[PDB]
Design a protein around this nucleic acid. Sequence first.
RNA 1: AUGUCUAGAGUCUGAUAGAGGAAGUUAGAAUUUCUGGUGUAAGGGUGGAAUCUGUUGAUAUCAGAAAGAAUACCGGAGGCGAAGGCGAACUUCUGGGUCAAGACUGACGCUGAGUCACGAAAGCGUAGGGAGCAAACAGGAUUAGAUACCCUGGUAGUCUACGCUGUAAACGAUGCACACUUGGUGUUAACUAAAAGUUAGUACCGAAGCUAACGUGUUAAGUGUGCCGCCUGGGGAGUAUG
Lengths: 132, 63, 27, 97, 277, 88, 69
Amino acid sequence: MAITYSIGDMLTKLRNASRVGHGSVDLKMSNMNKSILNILKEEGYIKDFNFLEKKGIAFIRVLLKYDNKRNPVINKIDAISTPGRKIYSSYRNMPRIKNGYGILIISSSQGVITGKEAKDKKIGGELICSVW
Amino acid sequence: SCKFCDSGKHPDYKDFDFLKKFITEQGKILPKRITGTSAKHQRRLALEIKRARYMALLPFVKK
Amino acid sequence: PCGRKRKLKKISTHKRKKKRRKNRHKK
Amino acid sequence: MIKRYEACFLFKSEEIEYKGSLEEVKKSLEFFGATDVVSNFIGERALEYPIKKQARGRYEIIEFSMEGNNLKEFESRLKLIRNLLRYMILVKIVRKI
Amino acid sequence: MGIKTYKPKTSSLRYKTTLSFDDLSKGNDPLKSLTKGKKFKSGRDSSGRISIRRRGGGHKRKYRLIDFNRRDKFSIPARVASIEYDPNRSANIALLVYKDGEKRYIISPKGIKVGDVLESGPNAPIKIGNALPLENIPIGRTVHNIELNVGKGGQLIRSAGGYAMILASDGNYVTVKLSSGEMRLIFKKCIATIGEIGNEDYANISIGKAGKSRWLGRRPKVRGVAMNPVDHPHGGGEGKTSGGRHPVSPWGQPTKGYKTRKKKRYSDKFIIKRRNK
Amino acid sequence: MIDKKQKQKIVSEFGKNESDTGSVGVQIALITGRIKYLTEHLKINKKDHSSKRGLLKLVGQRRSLLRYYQKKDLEAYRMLISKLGLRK
Amino acid sequence: MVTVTVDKNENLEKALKRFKRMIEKEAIIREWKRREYYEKPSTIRVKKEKAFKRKQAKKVRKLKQKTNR
RNA sequence: AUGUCUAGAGUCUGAUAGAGGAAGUUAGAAUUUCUGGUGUAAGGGUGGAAUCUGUUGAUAUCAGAAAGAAUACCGGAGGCGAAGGCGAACUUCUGGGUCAAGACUGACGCUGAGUCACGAAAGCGUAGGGAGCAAACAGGAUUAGAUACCCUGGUAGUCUACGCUGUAAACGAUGCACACUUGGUGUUAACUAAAAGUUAGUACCGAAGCUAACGUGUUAAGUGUGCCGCCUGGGGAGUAUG
Ligand SMILES: [Zn+2]
């Protein structure tokens, strides 16, 4: 099967649905996927996400958010760390994505947290993805 | 317009007088696009015609 | 493709094969 | 493995030779262990391409059951019957079921 | 059957191959009541001259009384007892034990095995090893050991690996393709044995050295250009001539293509189409 | 062929119950039976190459299952190889 | 073996018109001109390739002309 | 490191399509040769000729016999296989795929350096076979010349069994696997009585996107990653040497 990304699969599905301009997208469900979508939700990139059922398997249905002119909120969403190339960073060397206009998402000792929260709590970890 | 599909009976060399209508007047098989038969039936029909020809039920060429 | 490059390769191959044929049977 | 075979045979024209040939064919199946032998006469037709100088012959259909391994040997013996012009043996039909 | 090769531990073994005798009921001595000791021939005749050259002293061998004429044992089944090596011919010999107690030798066909039951006569089944008159054998079979005159025995094909092909039958005669390749007519009442003759690797052997050729009873062959003109028409080799003459036998008979069969032989009626070069 | 009867027979022997087809022991045993009759078939028909490819795919599957089983349940693995004759 | 039985009162002209038509409907002459001399299976396949491509371009062409009009 | 789950992947059950492979049998058309009739001066061939064949009876036509190789029609915007490839008919042996609530195992998977297996055609070794076709080669023509294109012949080879060689424009010039991303028109198989739709393939056109352009476009060359192979100006050169 070599899924190789419970993370990149959802990222790619979300990216594709967002650019074609769908209303909702329907992802596999995991603790990290939930955490990431939660961070998106606070940051105002997605409207909401719900938990569901199909054939006894749980899904996450995410409500894509666009402006009134159908320009997506997500512009570019892309992975940094990667099974063949794992990228870790200290809390000082954390990149500020696009001069802060975007957000960085990392996995740290205290859970999956945004870059600003990682800086404010003085913790660092794996660089999951960058969204702007 | 597949006659075998319409009649519900399936190609068989024993039923050779019926087979004789899908043969030209000296043995050559007719194309699907002419006889208007279905593909699966056409394959089975060709096989049965070959079997009959092996049993002299049907002619290779008329003499 | 223009095919001049393929022609170049062809004549090279012919010359190499001719060399080998010439030096066959020699010992 | 017992398999339900179905076969067609051609015999030369006259009736006594037809019957005799069919009889050794039947006993041949019985020797090779055939079970559930059933026949069906088709008739006496004029062949439309000559076979072994003949032009007219009688057709028989036999639907029997028999294990796989003896088909080889059975076949090797059916070549000995003088009056069996041509024949073929088939596995069962692709019945619509 | 099979071929057994040798590692080159001497300069002679490099291309020596012999048969493998796996298809032979081994460890065998011949039946004492059927074999007699005999001289080695060497090609001299009653007058004492050499009539055939270049035949000499090979390995001493006994003679096994074969039976190519199974006619006086029709309808009587027999058992195959063993398959044995025969030094007097290429093919192997099978020892048949008859139901009445008589034992006999036959040429061993290809594919028979110990314990088989063999039968001879018009009523015998068409099975490898049975002997039947050509009447009864169906067109399209392969036979061997063909009889030429009723009561004579099998005088046609007999050597290892050979077989004859029945082509057609007509009147008193059957058309048979022989191993040389000609098509000959045979009288329909003579007998024949069904199936090919076993031991078909016999001639795939590479002898290996001059010594084995001497074992087989074959003295050396002296060419004609090595002679003097008194000895052979080709002699005179003052510096490697080629005869200086169209090739001939040592007695002046031409040898490259000359046809030596008599032009008006008695059997010319029975030969359809001769062999091919 | 491995007929339905020996298929079910081996299932009954090697599984915990009559419905336990999918367990690893049943898997390996069935594939071993297939391998045996295929090596018999391919001993005769030496120029059959599609069958040889099928045989090799089966052998690879058996090795994969054997590694998974040996890593997970070791003593069952040694019992199984000893019972089936698969050398180690 | 294509035959045309000539009736007692039937005219030779239409008789061989029938012959010509059923010959053409058996495609004997085209088969013979095909078997005159050998062709690589490669070149049979390639000529069929090209013939179908020509047919497709011609059909697209024809429909373009029909809609252009 | 030790467990748990089933949605991935497998086993079992049922259904089903197919030139998938190997072995053993059989068939007819056509061609060539041979034999026997009828019959006479041409046949054959080209842009045009000639070589050649034929008065020792050609070609043409009728009948019979023999051998070899290949399987018209079905037959295609098909089908199957990993690829090469696989099409007269039958049996035996045997590989793979697809669908489903239809239960079982519970991550058992993806890719894969060496290695191993297979691998069109040509070629090689051993032993057969040899109709037709046909390198080399011969003759006749074209030409200044023709070691060619054309014509008449013709040996290997083409075929079979076994053992080697492991190369192709071996191509979709596009490695494999998974998760996603508007449609139009056909077609194959299955589920459904059938339409009608779905699923798994297989073709054409085409939106967005991508592309240096050509083009590609749910069978991506689109958006992502896993692993392997490979490239770093041309000639020298896939040469020299090992
Ligand atoms: Zn139909």
